[PDB]
Design a protein around this ligand. Structure first.
Ligand code: CLA
Ligand code: CLA
Ligand code: CLA
Ligand code: CLA
Ligand code: CLA
Ligand code: CLA
Ligand code: CLA
Ligand code: CLA
Ligand code: CLA
Ligand SMILES: CC1=C(/C=C/C(C)=C/C=C/C(C)=C/C=C/C=C(C)/C=C/C=C(C)/C=C/C2=C(C)CCCC2(C)C)C(C)(C)CCC1
Ligand code: SF4
Lengths: 670, 250, 98, 86, 51, 51, 51, 122
């Protein structure tokens, strides 16, 4: 069985694809080898190998994630100031990340504690550890050990399943079994397990810390043995979320444990219900969507939506102790999950297109013109409406006519449904604050919030237009009637019919990545400006609030010039003036590098490969002149690869620019 | 009958599960199951293990076999197979089980709207409720542009009255002089200007495209359309003036 | 090679061959699958203490061949070059000698 | 309409004919190659211009050359579907 | 100097290969500006001298 | 082959022209961007005197 | 447009058929936009900085 | 605190080491001499010589390997013994390269390599 696991193919690069068997005649062979590496569908051998590869690769990636978790745990146990952060979280910035004293890189470590200098981490791992009752270094040691053991176990399982599974293997196709066991045993039987963990280790510990005994009598009290504290020790009646814990500025962990217990019960009951529930309508979906790419797209869309829900729920539904006051942590936790939501949504669209090209589509593709046409009209309507309210405000403010602009002190567009959406939270008529820092105050939504929400809707709709147009017009179109034979990813069909560049679903993803990036850059900026202007900030003992941006949002965000001046210029002073400043030197440098990479992408985005091919031939003349012949013949990047490289550099550079801009400012202000 | 489907031990697969497999699998595939089909594994094992053959297996081999066979719940029942065999029949017959999009999904309305039009290969004749229903057809036919028995000037007058009456509002309110004591004569002038501009555009259209669907027999081509556009301008003036009169008086 | 004594038999004689082995393991059915990674899947006829290694089959020659691949060669050389630059910077910082 | 020209270097592959999506090309008998056949383009009025024929041609430089003429486009050379020019 | 060199490089390459390059050895039969030479032969976006 | 016109003589060795123009462009870009990056990095690291 | 009630009975698109810009036209229009933006963004900066 | 003491010592050593280096009368930042002086602090002649030697070494090793492996299979699966042999042999590049230049073994006549695209025929 395992005697066929041989290294003889390690030296034979490109073995998996039969199109690469001719050998590396040109440099295009290298890029094709890298491109087809994970494309198990088109690789050689039967369908059973596809299942084995998919499952074992999933296990290998799971081992990789476990290794990353183990690295974070070891950094927290042996390369961090988590001790002093535990003792005083409101005066110590989290830091489990040092820099070596080479090339003066010592300037990157900054004062986080009197005994520690390092890079302020914004992953929120310290708050997670405190919410996980991790106090001693031994606990982090054993967490790291368990994560390393999990890495080894998952790696070994990925190794084994390449030969345990065979041609007869069918457990992956049993979707009823997968859904039932997943749902019940994981969402139900593991949620209650975490509820048990919290009830037996957090409530014995986190109340002890909040009770002021950071000593906890060392292990005499902290090491469990506290069955005289009661599970609902400090619920204080009320409703979950209406009253926060005054000490840690978060929801009481007893309520979180009850939530996990009840959610596990609900999931178990739903698994029991699924024995007899509503069906026979999603049944066409049931039979037509049993394929790798469709389920991958469905899961990607679902996980991305969950990621955006997490992004919006991690900030002003504070669960973690001492996390609402840690403003850089809140900002990072929102924005990182926002970006992941966008990226995984785009991936869902791509794999929907791939499923359409490999499998057979459904009924909705036959009236695709009305669908992707009313989508076009709605995109045009909300683009010519949302953005232009900004253009109108801008023009009339430049003209000196502020009474004719869309503002609160002018023609005002009230957010009617949001203002009547006091259902969410429904907190008492005041704010909450822990230590000179605002925990959460209700965002008073006005005209600017209305306009920016419509901008969000417009960008979302345009990205969805690109994605659905790629998906629905994958097999064929009025433009080209045999797009199915062209495959999933192709540069074009030729300069004929006026020009057929970028008709493939791959190119539709290529444009959709740009539009998703543009969509949630505005989301990032809206969050980053709104929180600073209207939520975060200092306090005055006379109940007066001094925010970080001093309420710039409601008065400046009504015009594009307001965004340019009060957000991208005034709030970029921290990152731009960050040279020789200990903590924020890398952020200024990375700001510069992000600008460089973003501009560098434009060389690939704007140019075609024929010019570069001719230039490469001109250079190859000089190489052949001096008897330097590369027998792997130099070829310029393929059209699809040029577009991919351009998109990757564009998004990476822009994301790095925002990343530095937000993080350096929040680190300086805090 | 087929050789390997007879006297198959229950331990390899149960009787009801095997019958469910045979029902789900198309009849032509029983003799030689394809590959990666539960019936293929049933054939590849029932021809090795049985009464006259190897009657025992290693525990791990039997464990792997039990995870290659269906678990009696992942197979469509008779009613589900009927659902598919009839849904596909509807779809191929040119009829669509009517569904309406909802919150990321669609509700089936339990209606069979015949989908392909009179010209089945025509893309714009696929009949929908909003364009080919009785109400939609009679509403479109009764519009001023389509109403039977209307002289071209009557269509123009009606359309112009509608446009002129409506166009006053966006200017007299939220306009540059929305707060001035008059604030409505400005809106009247702007609405009349919009009516005149669109009437000029219609005249351009009638002198360039020259639609001939309103011309009476033996007339200068496009004369009906030009008359309709001129009377739309007149009706726009009238409707704008009437809206302004109502605003000022009331 | 690794099955020098297995009494390996074909599907056609699943219940015909009974001569067990040099051990007492019953004969094993060999199924010729078409997968290149699993060309032959062997099925048992009963309880057996068969030695089936889970370790892979690697050798020094093709491991060296893999390390002779241009990626590994040009990654080892560039890694050593970068490490040498870093070590030189640690040992002679700020290029004071210049 | 474009201009699709066939040159003497043709070796009677028939690949250009098979790759054409609008039946512009055809095989005619000839005596200038071992295949005794060369391509021809009798119906370039239906040539959309996809240049698949050029992709399929294996001669050193294409024996079939498609010259794009954008100020010449007809309804057939544009692949018009929603609109008729006749 | 870098900017001037690269601008002259692009312009001079376009001028010298306007009548034919190794990739498209018939470029003087076509217009000064034309779309491309098709996705085949490796892909030929931005191949004209106008490009 | 008649190397009489000036454009002819330029076209005979056009590959040499373009290759050397590419070389000088690459040199200028590499050694300007790299020195600018050195200065940026060493001045971000509180060392103006290491430029 | 060919599906909207009133438009279809006045304009079938056979006269001035709407088509996407050709490849060379697209490149030129993008170049014009890029050049206009890059050039005309500077004089406001010059006037704001010097005056 | 100890690491900052080490950093302070490094800074003071940098101050005393750059004392002989020339800096402008208005910036204070030491300058690099690119006049070919060969005998001043911060001169660019020594780094230029070192880099040119090692860069010619790299190029010569690569060219030697390409000449001795006239195959595409040897470029993806590097013949490591031959590769390191050429890498070690590249030290004598300033002499071997010139001896090949003058003896007609480096360059190739233009009539043996593809000149470029045709510019005429008719
Ligand atoms: C997968 C996630 C991950 C990531 C991103 C990092 C990243 C890092 N680790 Mg790390 N680490 C990880 C997992 C990870 N580790 C795990 C799982 C363990 C436990 C085995 C460790 C144990 C560890 C130690 C003990 C140290 C680091 C150090 C470092 C830093 C410098 C690494 C270095 O010198 O290069 C080494 C490069 C190579 C060996 C090339 C291969 C760097 C930020 C060092 C540090 O922060 O110094 C202050 C340090 O001393 N790590
Ligand atoms: C998501 C993770 C995952 C999933 C779904 C499975 C699923 C499976 N494994 Mg598996 N496995 C995993 C992770 C996983 N494994 C890891 C991480 C390891 C390393 C310890 C193993 C090691 C392993 C072995 C050694 C065996 C299985 C076997 C099996 C099969 C039966 C086991 C059972 O009842 O459950 C089943 C297909 C057994 C099998 O193939 O049954 C024939 C078997 O022999 N697995
Ligand atoms: C009955 C016990 C119970 C308790 C104490 C909680 C408690 C909580 N839930 Mg919860 N939940 C429960 C049952 C419970 N849940 C059940 C049965 C479901 C299934 C429908 C959910 C589904 C659910 C979701 C989907 C979310 C919560 C969230 C929350 C938190 C915010 C509370 C808030 O602002 O409410 C105001 C009133 C809080 C810790 C939110 C959260 O985790 O915030 C980060 C959140 O997004 N819950
Ligand atoms: C669970 C997630 C998941 C999974 C399993 C897959 C799986 C697959 N995808 Mg896919 N995809 C995903 C998410 C996922 N994708 C997302 C989120 C997107 C949106 C961006 C896409 C977009 C996408 C496209 C457009 C295509 C695929 C394709 C494929 C298939 C082959 C992939 C391959 O060989 O690439 C090999 C792997 C690589 C080339 C990785 C290279 C690294 C990337 C490109 C750059 C990342 C830069 C990095 C983040 C930053 C560097 C740090 C910097 C500081 C240096 C395979 C079925 C291809 C296909 O043909 O499908 C059949 C294809 O054309 N996917
Ligand atoms: C620049 C704006 C503008 C334009 C292009 C037109 C255009 C036209 N007007 Mg007009 N009009 C305008 C503003 C404008 N109007 C205003 C502000 C008033 C109010 C005084 C009028 C009052 C007006 C009258 C009273 C009449 C026109 C008529 C006409 C048409 C001859 C032509 C379509 C004539 C018309 O419709 O006859 C067919 C006509 O009798 N206009
Ligand atoms: C039903 C017909 C009708 C009636 C009752 C009125 C009535 C009135 N108009 Mg009027 N008007 C009409 C049609 C009418 N108009 C039309 C068709 C036009 C377009 C030429 C105008 C243009 C018009 C102007 C430009 C003005 C009036 C004004 C007035 C008021 C004096 C009075 C309320 C005047 C007024 O009071 O404005 C505030 C004024 O300035 N009207
Ligand atoms: C030719 C390049 C080169 C040279 C001369 C050195 C030389 C040295 N390294 Mg070093 N190193 C290099 C490359 C190099 N390394 C690379 C590429 C890495 C990968 C990140 C490292 C990672 C590394 C670490 C993590 C450490 C050293 C250390 C050392 C010193 C002790 C010897 C040792 O531990 O071996 C180094 C081991 C290897 C080069 C093998 C890597 C596999 C020594 C001066 C140690 C030190 O400072 O001693 C106090 C130490 O802790 N090096
Ligand atoms: C930040 C943006 C950026 C950057 C860095 C470059 C960089 C480069 N371009 Mg480029 N280009 C760009 C944007 C950019 N481009 C845009 C937007 C266009 C419009 C389509 C072009 C169009 C273009 C053409 C048409 C040509 C270049 C050329 C070059 C090269 C010049 C030689 C050189 O300096 O190499 C030094 C290399 C670097 C500075 C890159 C950094 C290398 C590491 C990081 C050090 C170089 C690779 C020319 C070329 O190929 O020269 C040989 C050339 O012919 N570019
Ligand atoms: C054997 C390696 C080798 C050699 C001897 C040369 C030699 C030359 N190249 Mg060159 N080149 C190479 C590899 C090599 N190249 C590679 C891999 C690339 C792809 C990035 C290029 C890209 C390139 C361009 C774009 C240009 C040249 C140019 C030139 C000429 C001027 C010198 C120059 O610009 O150098 C500078 C060289 C570079 C910037 C490329 C990077 C150098 C690579 C990384 C070295 C690789 C060596 C290899 C790994 C050795 C392995 C040995 C081992 C297997 C034993 C000169 C004839 C120029 C020219 O034609 O002007 C006359 C020019 O414009 N080259
Ligand atoms: C919102 C709504 C809707 C819609 C509605 C509409 C669309 C309305 C319209 C309305 C309109 C749009 C109206 C109009 C009216 C008009 C009028 C009523 C006019 C009148 C006029 C006149 C009366 C004039 C006269 C004259 C002339 C003719 C000329 C001379 C002068 C004079 C003045 C005499 C719907 C259903 C969808 C749904 C929900 C609700
Ligand atoms: S593909 Fe080219 S060589 Fe072959 S028959 Fe057609 S024109 Fe001739």
């Amino acid at each position: 069985i395992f005697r066929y696991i041989n290294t003889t193919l390690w030296a034979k690069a490109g073995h998996f694809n039969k199109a690469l068997s001719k050998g590396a005649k040109t440099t295009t062979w290298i890029w094709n080898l890298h491109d087809y590496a994970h494309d198990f569908d088109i690789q050689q051998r039967s369908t059973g190998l596809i299942a084995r590869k998919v499952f074992s690769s999933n296990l290998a990636h799971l081992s990789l994630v476990f290794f990353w978790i183990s690295g974070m745990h070891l950094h927290g146990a042996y390369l961090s100031n988590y001790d002093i952060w535990l003792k005083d979280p409101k005066s110590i910035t989290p830091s489990s990340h040092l820099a070596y004293s080479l090339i003066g890189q010592d300037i990157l470590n900054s004062y986080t504690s009197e005994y520690f200098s390092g890079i302020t981490i914004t992953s929120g791992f310290f708050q997670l550890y405190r919410s996980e009752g991790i106090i001693t270094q031994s606990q982090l040691k054993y967490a790291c050990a368990t994560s390393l053991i999990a890495t080894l176990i998952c790696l070994s399982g990925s190794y084994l399943h390449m030969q345990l599974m065979s041609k007869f293997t069918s457990f992956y196709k049993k979707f009823q079994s997968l859904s039932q066991d997943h749902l019940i045993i994981i969402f139900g039987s593991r949620s209650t397990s975490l509820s048990a963990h919290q009830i037996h280790k957090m409530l014995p510990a986190n109340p002890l810390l909040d009770s002021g005994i950071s000593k906890p009598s060392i292990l005499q009290v902290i090491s469990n043995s506290l069955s005289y504290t009661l599970a609902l020790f400090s619920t204080n009646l009320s409703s979950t979320g209406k009253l926060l814990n005054p000490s840690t500025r978060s929801v009481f962990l007893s309520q979180v444990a009850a939530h996990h217990k009840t959610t596990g019960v609900v999931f178990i009951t739903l698994g029991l219900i699924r024995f007899l529930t509503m069906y026979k309508s999603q049944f066409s979906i049931l039979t037509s969507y049993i394929d790798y790419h469709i389920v991958l797209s469905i899961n990607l869309a679902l996980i991305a939506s969950l990621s955006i829900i997490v992004a919006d729920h991690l900030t002003r539904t504070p669960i973690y102790p001492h996390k609402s006051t840690s403003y850089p942590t809140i900002l990072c936790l929102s924005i990182h999950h926002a970006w992941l939501s966008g990226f995984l949504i785009i991936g869902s669209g791509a794999h929907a297109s791939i499923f359409n090209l490999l499998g057979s589509p459904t009924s909705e593709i036959r009236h695709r013109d009305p669908i992707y046409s009313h989508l076009i009209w709605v995109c045009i309507a909300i683009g010519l409406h949302s953005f232009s309210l900004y253009c109108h405000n801008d023009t009339l403010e430049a003209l000196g006519r502020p009474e004719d602009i869309f503002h609160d002190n002018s023609i005002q567009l009230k957010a009617i449904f949001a203002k009547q959406s006091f259902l969410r939270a429904e907190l008492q008529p005041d704010i909450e604050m822990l230590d000179k820092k605002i925990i959460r105050i209700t965002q008073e939504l006005g005209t600017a919030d209305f306009i920016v929400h419509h901008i969000h809707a417009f960008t979302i709709h345009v990205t969805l237009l690109i994605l659905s147009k790629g998906v629905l017009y994958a097999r064929n179109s009025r433009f080209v009637s045999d797009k199915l034979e062209l495959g999933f990813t192709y540069p074009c069909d030729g300069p004929g019919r006026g020009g057929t560049c970028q008709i493939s679903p791959w190119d539709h993803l290529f444009s959709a990545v740009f539009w998703m990036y543009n969509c949630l850059n505005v989301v990032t900026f809206h969050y980053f400006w709104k929180m600073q202007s209207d939520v975060w900030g200092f306090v005055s003992i006379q109940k007066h609030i001094s925010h970080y941006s001093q309420g710039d949002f409601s008065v400046n965000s009504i015009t594009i010039n307001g965004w340019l001046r009060n957000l991208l210029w005034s709030e970029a002073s921290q990152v731009i003036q960050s040279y020789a400043l200990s903590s924020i030197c890398p952020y200024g440098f990375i700001f510069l590098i992000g600008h460089f990479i973003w501009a560098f992408s434009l060389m690939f985005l704007f140019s075609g490969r024929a010019y570069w091919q001719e230039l490469i031939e001109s250079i190859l003349w000089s190489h052949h002149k001096l008897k330097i012949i590369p027998h792997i013949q130099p070829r310029a990047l393929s059209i699809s690869q040029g577009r991919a490289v351009g998109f990757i550099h564009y998004t990476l550079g822009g994301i790095g620019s925002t990343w530095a801009f937000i993080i350096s400012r929040l680190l300086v202000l805090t | 009958k087929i050789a390997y489907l007879q006297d198959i031990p229950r331990t390899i697969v149960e009787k009801d599960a095997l019958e469910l497999i045979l029902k789900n699998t198309p009849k032509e595939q029983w003799e030689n199951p394809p590959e990666d089909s539960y019936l293929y594994t049933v054939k590849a094992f029932a021809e090795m293990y049985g009464p006259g053959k190897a009657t025992k297996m290693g525990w791990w081999d039997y464990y792997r076999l039990k995870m290659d066979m269906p678990d009696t719940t992942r197979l469509s029942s008779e009613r589900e197979l009927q659902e598919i065999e009839e849904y596909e029949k509807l779809m191929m017959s040119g009829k669509v089980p009517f569904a309406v999009p909802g919150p990321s999904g669609y509700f089936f309305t339990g209606f069979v709207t015949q989908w392909k039009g009179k010209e089945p290969f025509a893309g714009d004749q696929v009949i929908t409720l909003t364009e080919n229903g009785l109400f939609a057809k009679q509403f479109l036919s009764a519009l001023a542009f389509y109403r039977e028995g209307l002289k071209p000037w009557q269509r123009g007058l009606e359309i112009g009255m509608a446009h002129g009456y409506f166009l006053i509002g966006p200017f007299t309110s939220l306009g540059p002089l929305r707060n001035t004591p008059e604030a409505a004569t400005v809106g009247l002038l702007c609405g009349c200007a919009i009516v005149g501009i669109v009437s000029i555009g219609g005249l351009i259209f009638g002198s360039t495209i020259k639609p001939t669907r309103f011309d009476k027999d033996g007339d200068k081509p496009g004369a009906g359309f030009i008359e309709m556009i001129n009377w739309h301008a007149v009706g726009g003036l009238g409707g704008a003036g009437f809206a302004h009169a109502l605003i000022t008086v009331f | 090679a690794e099955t020098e004594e297995g009494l390996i038999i074909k599907p056609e004689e699943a219940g015909k061959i009974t001569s067990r082995d040099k051990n007492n393991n019953p004969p094993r059915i060999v199924v010729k699958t078409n997968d290149w990674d699993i060309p032959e899947y062997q099925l048992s006829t009963g309880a057996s203490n068969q030695v089936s290694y889970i370790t892979p089959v690697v050798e020094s020659e093709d491991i060296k061949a893999w390390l002779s691949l241009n990626v590994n060669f040009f990654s080892i050389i560039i890694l050593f070059t970068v490490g040498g630059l870093i070590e030189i910077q640690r040992f002679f910082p700020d290029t004071l000698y210049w | 309409s474009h201009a699709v020209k066939i040159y003497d270097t043709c070796i009677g592959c028939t690949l250009c004919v098979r790759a054409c999506p609008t039946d512009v090309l055809e095989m005619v008998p000839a005596s200038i190659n071992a295949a005794k056949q060369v391509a021809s383009s009798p119906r370039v009025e239906d040539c959309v211009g996809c240049k698949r024929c050029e992709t399929a041609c294996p001669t050193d430089f294409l024996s079939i050359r498609v010259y794009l003429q954008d100020n010449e486009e007809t309804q057939y050379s544009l692949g018009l579907d929603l609109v008729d020019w006749s | 100097a870098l900017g001037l060199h690269i601008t002259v490089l692009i312009l001079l390459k376009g001028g010298l290969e306007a009548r034919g390059s190794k990739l498209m050895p018939d470029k003087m039969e076509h217009s000064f500006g034309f779309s491309c030479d098709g996705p085949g032969r490796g892909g030929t976006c931005d191949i004209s001298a106008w490009d | 082959q008649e190397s009489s016109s000036k454009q002819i003589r330029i076209h005979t060795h056009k590959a040499a022209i373009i290759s050397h123009l590419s070389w000088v462009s690459l040199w200028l870009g590499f050694h300007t961007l790299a020195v600018y990056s050195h200065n940026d990095t060493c001045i971000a690291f509180n060392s103006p005197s290491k430029q | 447009h060919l599906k909207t009630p009133i438009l279809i009975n006045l304009w079938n698109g056979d006269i001035y058929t709407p088509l996407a810009l050709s490849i060379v036209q697209a490149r030129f229009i993008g170049l014009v936009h890029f050049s206009t933006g890059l050039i005309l963004t500077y004089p406001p900066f010059i006037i704001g900085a010097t005056s | 605190y100890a690491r900052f003491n080490k950093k302070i010592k490094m800074i003071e050593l940098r101050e005393t080491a750059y004392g002989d280096r020339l800096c402008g009368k208005k910036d204070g930042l030491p300058r690099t001499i690119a006049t070919g002086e060969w005998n001043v602090r911060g001169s660019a002649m020594w780094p230029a010589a070192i880099f040119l030697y090692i860069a010619g070494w790299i190029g010569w090793a690569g060219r030697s390997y390409l000449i001795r492996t006239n195959d595409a299979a040897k470029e993806i699966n590097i013949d490591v013994p031959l590769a390191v042999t050429c890498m070690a042999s590249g030290f004598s590049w300033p002499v071997a390269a010139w001896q090949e230049i003058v003896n007609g073994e480096m360059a190739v006549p233009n009539d043996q390599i593809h000149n470029g695209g045709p510019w005429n025929q008719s």
